[PDB]
Design a protein around this ligand. Structure first.
Ligand SMILES: NC(=O)C1=CN([C@@H]2O[C@H](COP(=O)(O)OP(=O)(O)OC[C@H]3O[C@@H](n4cnc5c(N)ncnc54)[C@H](OP(=O)(O)O)[C@@H]3O)[C@@H](O)[C@H]2O)C=CC1
Ligand code: SF4
Ligand code: SF4
Ligand code: SF4
Lengths: 143, 208, 113, 59, 22, 337, 156, 176, 385, 55, 95
């Protein structure tokens, strides 16, 4: 009974991170689950899978570091996920993109730059569709 | 003629009609039209000088206890000199009946206040005072509902812009919110979706 | 012709306005202190005289009396220490630029009418 | 002359500056329908509307 | 293959409360 | 571009200001006045994003811009002034920052701004000194203005030289310090205030005047010197300051050097002093009465008397017994004219 | 272990101290609010973050605006914004408070909430999903984290 | 059809009476009710571990807008300008102009999220299925300006999410 | 006496009321409920919009229950168009009309508990209201302000997945109400806070036009279902609570009973949905499937028209009451026959209640007043508008 | 989720909780479902469809 | 490879870049103007022209009810390709 639960605890201690890694993954993701199964971790963002956990908690992610050649852990957030896996955490699709990779058309982005409101990258709205009246041309000739 | 069409309830139309002539009898002095559509929805005129005496009668049983002023719904049509069209929706609970009894007024006609009679119109009052300017007989206070404090306008007059003339913003050195001239960006890009070619010949006001 | 609001002929109405002016004219310092207006009180009384001037073209007693009805209704919100200091200052429009009635400047500004 | 110039909330500036236009609206040239010629309507004269420095909107 | 979701069966539910004295 | 719309927040005008010193007291005002007209305004800043957050209401979407830049670098100044058509300047600091010596504030920087403004082809580079600028052994900061006035006068020769005197506002250092003395208790003055006289200038007037100065082609090399409505003697001036502060007033004489020593004791703090050896003499200096220089009404703006402006500035200091009190009852301070 | 460096690490302490425990004030003006409750409902639960629904305009710091902002209401909101002690922050929420929203054209609403108080981050939505709101707050914390008043003062 | 609430009359019987007075004294039921809250301590807590976990969403879900292309890589938009006629808040603004190739094309499609009410009409209304109310929802900005989207940003949004968007449409399209 | 403005700022004020009181020691004298702090003025904003465009406005008034508002519009528009919907659409409108009713009453219950300081039920039950928002999201793509009920009926057919989980959802819910049964329903403190407070005589109610449970609590039996089963209610089985004392305790127990009642109904609506279109056959009112519009011409034509100028109501101005859980709801159309309404007043059920509050205010201590706002289920959005 | 804790919990409950799971576990429903096909619609018959009646 | 403005910033796919005189250009400073890398224009003609020996054809944009309304392209003139009014992609009748 209780010994079984204490065993669950030791099992999730030794089931991930061994020793020094466990404390780090725990101070990063405050969850302490066994890293059951694995995602496609394209940028190290491993997408661990499990079912026994109650609904809504059965899919999850650990983001790793320097996404888009910038920033670090201790700055993790949303938008770090790729759009296919972005569909996967929200469980719009029971099937991870692994099994069903998407169309991969030529014009879609690849690195996925995530949200960037601060920093020099920054959306700027601006006037579009050129000009109007075209103001009259001044003469260049004297007299 | 059925799967989409809503069936016409002739029975209630008959009963409401007959009761309509009944009332037509009872108050010849103010009652005029006895409109009775296939929606089972009866309607009746009142002269504004006849507001109170009719309405009081309505609350009291004849064969319809017109209890509970559910609404004093109001409409403004600029064309008619009697531009205002105050409407008394009503519901005789005992008889589960519903009726719409309306009137008309000019800008300086002190139409009678049913405040003594229903009291529900302590605010149907001040809204329809404020939004419009429909001055009322005798009310404990004509202070404005809804519209601000120093606000001058009367929106729902179907007059002056939907944005209004007023657009307030906090200002710096005055350390305070201040009303300012509108300057809408982009502007309400109104679409004239009116359709030439009448779809309803059955209606159609004659050219005369 | 049509039945009057309250007053009939100007004097029944003229009586009401004076009642209004004093009703403001005494009330003004009370307002000056409740909201701690930085205006000198004579400026307040002057504005009191001015708003009574904008309504100079009125000639129907129903218009006069309806105006003192609405004006007393504004006095309601004033005396009850409703509104806010800003609302009291809305009458001033001091944030707004002065308007040059001169036509030449009106030429200089913009397309205008 | 039952003026309601003060009875209305409108600024004096907009009543001084402009005349309005009473008229009966014209039929579409591009369309057959006579139907909107009926019923009079009145409309105020258009004014200048500078472009929004941002996004190029009407202002 | 015509379909949509009409009811598949649906077992009993109790709107009635129970408050045991235990 | 050129103006369109009724003069307001959403209407446009061609103005492209680069207001240095926007972070400080006057700057928020002048930015408010440029912004109220719907003119777009660049606002270069160094203190931090949070410090100027309050300015965001002043603009309308695109009308404002914020730009970080080092004073120490020149190139940043070049970038910020690029599209500028006008470049107002307000950098200053009465108490002199330690890490940045006071000299630079009115010498090197104004000059770089001037030359780069010339390269920028700025339509109207503008600079703001003071009515007390003619060189004096008193107030090195005051002395420094004269050098800045000239260097700015040369590197960008058609620059205007504003000379406002003792502008008083809600956040004014000059008016508030006098009000703040009640916390001090006693009221020292260098031989009281009878020897010296001042003619303080209201700040909203100075700002709107800067705006209308930008609007006037006629101004260029003109050396404007802003002046107050009234030329009050300093002692009766303090009388009025506590007369509206309703605080207890106990004046006494104090030697200028001896007062200077206490000011030196107060200059020790990295934390900003209420009192400094600059402030000493900058107070004890009299305001020059100049007629020949252009009038304030040349901008069309009337002078606004301090008595019409004082109580709002000083209500925060007056005690609750007085904090809700009528304005008329203080009675105006005596005028030298 | 040098002079400037200590000021930096010391600054880290205060910004961390503040970002780690915001106290947003209850103030919802419309149906944005019933998302805000769900930000604090157990399924999401804002409280893990240390943030809490305090009452009053003083103990509370960040001011999460929500819902339509009419003509009448606005000055009150202004005053309330003045009421809270530094370092006050505000978070706009809902399309209505973003700039008049659905109602942008009416004599009713006061358009942009930014017209009254200097909003710091905008949250798009009608109403935003409560999680989008939560993410917007995480953005506010990162925004505080990058702020550095102490370092500027040292070199001021 | 009506039901009285309450109305029921308590027993005068002495056992029942002394029991009620025992509730009046020893509180009994409070503790019983009190006991119930204890049951929650033993249940598992409902929080999702945001953001390392995220809430369930239906494929239908509405969010950030994005213009999108043909499989060929041409933009789907034909500037039919009815989506401009529907946006209930009228956020949208369109200036259709001819392509040099001659095709109808918007020169300045734009929309502000400040006035968008995310009813998602336009996702339905477009004949060519041009604009799409995408999955993305998290995109709060530091400033108002970043909200007033050009056609440009919308195109970029259609660039990053096109795999996803097309995927959801692949899930949903029959219903419409 | 001491003059005092209250909200909006109070959590008790719900960010809307400013009911100033001129308090004595703590007993009230003057107690005026100012309003217009939320007044969105939608009446003119409705006027310049095509009738399909008006539809969002009603999600915007009743923040909580939503589908019922739109149904309140579809009835009132279909009257003038004389259009009778396919049955499945009506079984749906009842199904989500009742789930909206669950959301609304859970709202009113738990918040009224919050003003009484109960705290916990709130967190015990919003855990459920997310469970329902997951559903409106599954049928609309929006967690709230779903536009799924329309004048033609409905935007779209139900996804196959719901029919099971919703049952699962209500497989356990009765217990969740049992957990409340073990609290306030029996709890001692609660009775004292609410017993014999704001009692209202039947006549004042009939005068002010009180409706809904606010009548049913004080014994008036007036109702908008069984009196006028405007939809499938005529087929549906349920039974209506009536209060005795007019105690807030009464109204409370009523709302709990209605929640039970929806537990009864939704069972049967799950039990009885026909296959069929969930939209009207006409393309002159109800738009074509994307599959058909993109081949058949006329479908695309009328598609183009309804999405640009829309259907045209025959001219007429009318009024319709609605069985909102909060009371009678106002749909006062004024239509010239153009797709634009000429005018459109909207009577909020809570309008009359707030008109009546001051009658119940004076002579009661301030806690009584805080009790009263929660007595009447008043979401202030609908009330000023 | 330990059984003694379940016993003590239901003990305090006065109710089984296991009999009405509160937290939504495995059963839920599948997200990925086979296509709807949809009802054909009553008036898509070609033999007659004059507007004179359906109107 | 978007054509570069004299200021150096890339022009929009609808060309309209600001004048060197233009002060408004200041907005982009400290930030990044954004313009799409993938102009649709090049991608229009990038595709091979489909050809069918028949005559009248019916493009649907690929995907039944996943694209533009069904459209009947004529090929009366072999002197020119049959560009879609929607897809923008050409057709011809080879023989
Ligand atoms: N009554 C008065 O105050 C009078 C003032 N003047 C002159 O007019 C000018 C305006 O006065 P006022 O605005 O009150 O003074 P402030 O100190 O309020 O304005 C100066 C602003 O410029 C900033 N600044 C200037 N140089 C630097 C630098 N090198 N590094 C960082 N920040 C810098 C200051 O710090 P930051 O921006 O970094 O916060 C401050 O924000 C002053 O220079 C003053 O000498 C003249 C007559 C009267
Ligand atoms: S934001 Fe959109 S949804 Fe949230 S309240 Fe204002 S209008 Fe209603
Ligand atoms: S979606 Fe593309 S096509 Fe349909 S209207 Fe908006 S722009 Fe024109
Ligand atoms: S999102 Fe909703 S509101 Fe914004 S445009 Fe598309 S439809 Fe109109």
């Amino acid at each position: 009974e209780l010994v079984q639960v204490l065993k669950r605890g030791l099992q999730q201690i030794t089931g991930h991170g061994g020793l020094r890694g466990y404390l780090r993954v725990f101070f990063r993701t405050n969850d302490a689950k066994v890293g059951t199964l694995v995602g496609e971790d394209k940028y190290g963002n491993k997408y661990y899978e499990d079912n026994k956990q109650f609904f809504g908690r059965h899919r999850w992610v650990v983001y790793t570091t320097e996404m888009n050649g910038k920033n670090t852990f201790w700055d993790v957030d949303g938008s770090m996920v790729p759009p296919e896996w972005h569909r996967w955490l929200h469980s719009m699709t029971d099937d991870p993109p692994t099994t069903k990779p998407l169309t991969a058309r030529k014009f879609i982005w690849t690195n996925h730059k995530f949200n960037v409101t601060g920093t020099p990258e920054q959306y700027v709205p601006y006037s579009t569709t050129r000009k109007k009246i075209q103001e009259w041309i001044p003469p260049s000739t004297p007299y | 003629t059925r799967p989409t069409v809503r069936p016409r309830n002739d029975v209630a139309h008959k009963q409401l009609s007959a009761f309509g002539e009944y009332v037509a009898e009872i108050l010849p002095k103010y009652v005029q039209q006895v409109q009775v559509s296939c929606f089972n929805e009866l309607e009746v005129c009142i002269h504004p000088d006849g507001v109170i005496p009719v309405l009081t009668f309505l609350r009291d049983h004849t064969n319809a206890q017109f209890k509970s002023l559910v609404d004093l719904t109001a409409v403004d049509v600029p064309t008619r000199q009697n531009r205002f069209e105050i409407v008394y929706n009503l519901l005789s609970l005992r008889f589960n009946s519903r009726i719409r009894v309306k009137t008309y007024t000019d800008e300086l006609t002190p139409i009678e206040s049913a405040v003594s009679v229903f009291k529900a119109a302590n605010w149907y009052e001040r809204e329809i005072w404020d939004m419009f300017g429909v001055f009322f007989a005798n009310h404990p206070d004509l202070r404005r509902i809804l519209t601000d404090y120093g606000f001058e306008g009367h929106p729902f007059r179907k007059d002056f812009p939907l944005s209004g003339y007023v657009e307030l913003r906090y200002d710096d050195e005055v350390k305070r919110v201040v009303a300012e001239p509108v300057e809408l960006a982009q502007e309400f890009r109104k679409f004239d979706l009116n359709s030439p070619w009448e779809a309803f010949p059955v209606y159609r006001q004659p050219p005369e | 012709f049509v039945k009057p609001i309250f007053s009939r002929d100007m004097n029944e109405a003229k009586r009401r306005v004076r009642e209004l002016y004093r009703a403001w004219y005494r009330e003004v310092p009370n307002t000056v202190h409740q909201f701690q207006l930085d205006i000198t009180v004579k400026m307040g009384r002057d504005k009191v005289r001015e708003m009574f001037m904008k309504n100079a073209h009125v000639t129907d007693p129903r218009v006069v009396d309806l105006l003192v009805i609405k004006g007393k209704i504004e006095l309601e919100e004033t005396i009850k220490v409703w509104k806010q200091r800003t609302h009291v200052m809305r009458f001033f429009h001091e944030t707004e630029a002065p308007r040059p009635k001169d036509f030449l400047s009106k030429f200089y500004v913009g397309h205008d009418p | 002359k039952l003026d309601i110039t003060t009875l209305t909330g409108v600024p004096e500036e907009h009543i001084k500056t402009r005349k309005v236009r009473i008229f009966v609206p014209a039929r579409n040239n591009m369309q057959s329908g006579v139907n909107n010629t009926k019923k009079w309507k009145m409309e105020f004269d258009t004014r200048e509307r500078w472009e929004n420095p941002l996004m190029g909107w009407a202002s | 293959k015509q379909d949509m979701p009409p009811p598949g069966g649906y077992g009993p539910i109790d709107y009635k409360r129970n408050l045991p004295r235990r | 571009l050129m103006p369109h719309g009724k003069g307001g927040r959403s209407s446009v005008s061609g103005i492209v200001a680069t207001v240095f010193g926007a972070t400080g007291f006057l700057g928020r005002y002048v930015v408010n006045h440029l912004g109220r007209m719907g003119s777009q305004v660049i606002i270069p800043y160094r203190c931090d994003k949070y410090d100027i957050m309050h300015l965001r209401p002043m603009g309308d979407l695109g009308q404002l811009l914020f730009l970080e830049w080092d004073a120490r670098d020149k190139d940043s100044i070049r970038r910020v002034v690029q599209h500028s058509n006008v470049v107002i300047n307000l950098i200053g600091r009465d108490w002199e920052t330690k890490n940045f010596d006071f000299e630079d504030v009115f010498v090197k920087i104004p000059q770089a701004i001037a030359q780069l403004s010339k390269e920028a082809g700025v339509e109207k580079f503008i600079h703001v000194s003071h009515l007390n600028a003619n060189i004096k052994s008193s107030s090195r900061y005051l002395r420094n203005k004269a050098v800045g006035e000239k260097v700015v006068r040369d590197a960008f020769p058609e620059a205007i030289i504003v000379k406002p005197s003792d502008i008083f506002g809600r956040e004014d250092r000059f008016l508030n310090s006098f009000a703040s003395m009640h916390r001090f208790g006693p009221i020292p003055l260098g031989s009281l205030g009878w020897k010296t006289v001042k003619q303080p200038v209201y700040v909203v007037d100075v700002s709107k005047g800067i705006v209308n100065a930008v609007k006037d082609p006629d101004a260029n090399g003109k050396s404007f010197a802003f002046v107050g409505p009234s030329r009050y003697l300093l002692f009766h001036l303090v009388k009025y300051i506590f007369a509206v502060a309703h605080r207890l007033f106990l004046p006494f004489p104090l030697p200028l050097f001896a007062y200077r020593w206490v000011a030196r004791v107060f200059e020790i703090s990295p934390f900003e002093p209420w009192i400094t050896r600059d402030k000493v003499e900058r107070m004890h200096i009299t305001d020059m009465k100049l007629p020949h220089l252009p009038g304030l009404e040349d901008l069309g703006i009337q002078a606004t008397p301090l008595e019409l402006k004082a109580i709002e500035v000083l209500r925060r200091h007056r005690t609750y017994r007085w904090l809700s009190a009528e304005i008329e009852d203080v009675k105006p301070a005596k005028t030298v004219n | 272990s040098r002079g400037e460096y200590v000021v930096a690490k010391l600054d880290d302490l205060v910004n961390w101290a503040r970002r780690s425990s915001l106290w947003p004030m209850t103030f919802g003006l419309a149906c944005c609010a019933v998302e805000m409750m769900h930000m604090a409902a157990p399924r999401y639960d804002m409280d893990r973050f240390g943030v809490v629904f305090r009452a009053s305009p003083r103990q509370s710091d960040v001011m999460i605006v929500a819902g339509t902002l009419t003509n009448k209401m606005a000055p009150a909101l202004r005053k309330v914004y003045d009421q809270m002690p530094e370092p006050r922050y505000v978070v706009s929420m809902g399309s209505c408070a973003n700039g008049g929203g659905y109602y942008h054209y009416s004599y009713s609403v006061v358009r942009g909430c930014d017209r009254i108080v200097p909003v710091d981050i905008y949250i798009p939505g009608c109403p935003p999903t409560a999680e989008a709101l939560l993410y917007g707050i995480l953005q506010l914390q990162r925004k505080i984290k990058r702020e550095r008043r102490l370092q500027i003062w040292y070199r001021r | 059809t009506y039901k009285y609430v309450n109305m029921q009359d308590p027993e005068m019987d002495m056992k029942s009476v002394t029991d009620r007075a025992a509730r009046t004294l020893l509180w009994t039921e409070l503790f019983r009710g009190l006991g119930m809250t204890l049951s929650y301590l033993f249940r598992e807590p409902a929080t999702i571990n945001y953001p390392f976990e995220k809430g369930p969403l239906s494929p239908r879900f509405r969010g950030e807008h994005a213009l999108r292309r043909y499989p060929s890589g041409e933009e789907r938009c034909i500037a039919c300008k009815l989506c401009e006629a529907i946006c209930p808040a009228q956020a949208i603004t369109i200036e259709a102009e001819p392509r040099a190739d001659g095709s109808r094309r918007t020169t300045r499609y734009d929309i502000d999220m400040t006035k968008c009410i995310y009813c998602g009409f336009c996702q339905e209304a477009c004949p060519v299925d041009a604009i799409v109310e995408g999955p993305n929802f998290e995109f709060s900005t530091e400033t108002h300006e970043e909200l007033l989207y050009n056609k440009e940003k919308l195109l970029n949004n259609g660039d990053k999410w096109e795999a996803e968007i097309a995927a959801n449409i692949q899930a949903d399209y029959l219903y419409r | 006496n001491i003059t005092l403005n209250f909200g909006p700022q109070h959590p008790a004020a719900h960010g809307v009321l400013r009911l100033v009181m001129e308090l004595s020691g703590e007993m009230v004298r003057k107690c005026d409920p100012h309003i217009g702090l939320l007044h969105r003025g939608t009446e003119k904003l409705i006027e310049y919009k095509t009738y399909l465009q008006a539809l969002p406005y009603f999600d915007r008034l009743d923040y909580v229950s939503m589908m019922c508002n739109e149904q309140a519009y579809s009835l009132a528009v279909e009257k003038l168009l004389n259009i009778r919907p396919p049955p499945r659409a009506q079984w749906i409108r009842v199904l989500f009309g009742e789930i909206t009713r669950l959301l609304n009453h859970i709202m009113a219950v738990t918040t009224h508990a919050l003003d009484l300081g109960a705290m916990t039920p709130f967190f015990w039950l919003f855990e459920e209201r997310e469970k329902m928002f997951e559903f409106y999201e599954r049928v609309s793509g929006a967690r709230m302000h779903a536009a799924y009920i329309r004048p033609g009926g409905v935007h779209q057919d139900l996804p196959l997945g719901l029919m099971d989980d919703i049952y699962q959802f209500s497989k356990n819910f009765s217990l969740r109400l049992d957990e409340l049964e073990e609290l306030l329903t029996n709890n001692r403190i609660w009775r004292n806070r609410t017993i014999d407070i704001g009692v209202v005589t039947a006549e004042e109610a009939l005068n002010y036009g009180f409706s809904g449970v606010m009548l049913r609590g004080s014994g008036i039996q007036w109702d908008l279902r069984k009196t006028q089963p405007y939809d499938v209610y005529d087929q549906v089985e349920f039974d209506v609570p009536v209060g005795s004392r007019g105690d807030c305790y009464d109204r409370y127990l009523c709302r709990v009973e209605e929640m039970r009642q929806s537990l009864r109904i939704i069972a049967q609506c799950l039990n009885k949905m026909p296959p069929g279109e969930i939209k009207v056959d006409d393309a002159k009112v109800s738009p074509p499937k994307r599959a058909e519009m993109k081949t058949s011409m006329e479908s695309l034509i009328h598609h183009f028209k309804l999405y640009t100028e829309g259907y045209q109501v025959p001219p007429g101005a009318t009024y319709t009451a609605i069985e909102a859980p909060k009371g009678e709801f106002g749909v006062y159309l004024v239509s010239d026959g153009s797709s634009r309404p000429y005018r459109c007043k909207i009577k909020a059920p809570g309008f009359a209640h707030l008109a009546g509050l001051d009658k119940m205010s004076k002579g009661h201590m301030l806690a009584d007043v805080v009790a009263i706002i929660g007595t009447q289920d008043i979401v202030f959005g609908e009330v000023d508008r | 989720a330990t059984r003694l804790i379940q016993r003590l919990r239901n003990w305090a409950s006065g109710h089984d909780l296991q009999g009405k799971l509160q937290l939504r576990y495995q059963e839920i429903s599948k997200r990925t479902q086979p296509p709807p096909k949809l009802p054909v619609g009553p008036s898509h018959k070609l033999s007659n469809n004059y507007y004179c009646t359906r109107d | 490879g978007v054509r570069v403005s004299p200021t150096g910033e890339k022009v929009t796919h609808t060309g309209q870049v600001y004048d060197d005189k233009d002060y408004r250009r200041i907005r982009f400073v400290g930030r990044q103007k954004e313009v799409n890398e993938n102009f649709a224009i090049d991608l229009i003609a990038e595709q091979p022209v489909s050809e069918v020996e028949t005559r009248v054809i019916a493009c649907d944009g690929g995907g039944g009810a996943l694209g533009h309304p069904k459209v009947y392209i004529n090929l009366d003139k072999e002197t020119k390709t049959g560009t879609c009014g929607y897809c923008g992609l050409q057709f011809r009748q080879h023989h």
